[PDB]
């Protein structure tokens, strides 16, 4: 789902 894409970046950027 596209709405979750911004969440991946949030995770990967945070870690």
């Amino acid at each position: 789902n596209w709405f979750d894409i911004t969440n991946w970046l949030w995770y990967i950027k945070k870690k």
Epitope: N1, W2, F3, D4, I5, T6, N7, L9, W10, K13, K14
Partner: antibody, heavy 124, light 108 residues
């Protein structure tokens, strides 16, 4: 303040193309999803599409595919909406909405911040 | 996925308890359900996200519940400014859809 300032109202003729802007100021832009949601007179909101400005990852509604173009300008923090082949069924108010940030800015997907709206009257 | 809100118009008294229903044509993945409030002439305001979570600024009288295909918004005490149109929006898939809306008006 996280503000979304859209362009002014416009009267377009049937078949033409319109561009609506969305200046996002005071918050994260690239890694957060913006969305365009329109609302006809007397009806409810209808999600049209979205974009992630970081890598310009767009997501268009199946109804509006082939006729919709959402763009992002990271240098000026602006989101755009290109809608071609306008008809009477496209006369509505177009809102640009950014999602919300939670604990550590977790993208909540749901639309928290909205613009003032752009009134598009598709009539000759 | 087709969202269907219920009822069409909810006529209640100020201070009473309000419950609005949202029914999806298929299961919503991950509880991706949101409740928005809209007053005439304004952009909608996010009241509930992720089924039950509440954004900062929304008063505690609004609470979300449900799972699968049935969801419900609950206003424990209807204030004067709580009467408006309410829209439930799903966003578990790549194609988000809204509901037709529920008109929460004052009974008299």
């Amino acid at each position: 303040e996280v503000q979304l300032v859209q362009s002014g109202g416009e009267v377009k003729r049937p078949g033409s193309s319109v561009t609506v802007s969305c200046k996002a100021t005071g918050g994260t832009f690239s890694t957060l999803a913006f969305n365009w949601v329109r609302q006809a007179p007397g009806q409810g909101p209808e999600w049209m599409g979205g974009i992630v400005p970081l890598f310009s990852i767009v997501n268009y509604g199946q109804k509006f595919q082939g006729r919709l173009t959402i763009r992002a300008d990271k240098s000026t923090t602006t989101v755009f909406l290109d809608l071609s082949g306008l008809t009477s069924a496209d006369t509505a108010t177009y809102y640009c909405a950014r999602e919300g940030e939670g604990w550590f800015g977790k993208p909540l997907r749901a639309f928290e911040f909205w613009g003032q709206g752009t009134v598009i009257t598709v009539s000759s | 996925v087709v969202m269907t809100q219920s009822p069409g118009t909810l006529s209640l008294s100020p201070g009473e308890r309000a419950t609005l229903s949202c029914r999806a044509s298929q299961s919503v993945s991950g509880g991706a359900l949101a409740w928005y409030q809209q007053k005439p002439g304004q952009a909608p305001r996010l009241l509930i996200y992720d089924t039950s979570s509440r954004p900062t600024g929304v008063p505690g009288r609004f609470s979300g519940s449900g799972s699968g295909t049935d969801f419900s918004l609950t206003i424990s005490r209807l204030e004067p400014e709580d009467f408006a149109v309410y829209y439930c929006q799903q966003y578990g898939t790549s194609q988000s859809t809204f509901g037709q809306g529920t008109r929460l008006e004052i009974k008299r």
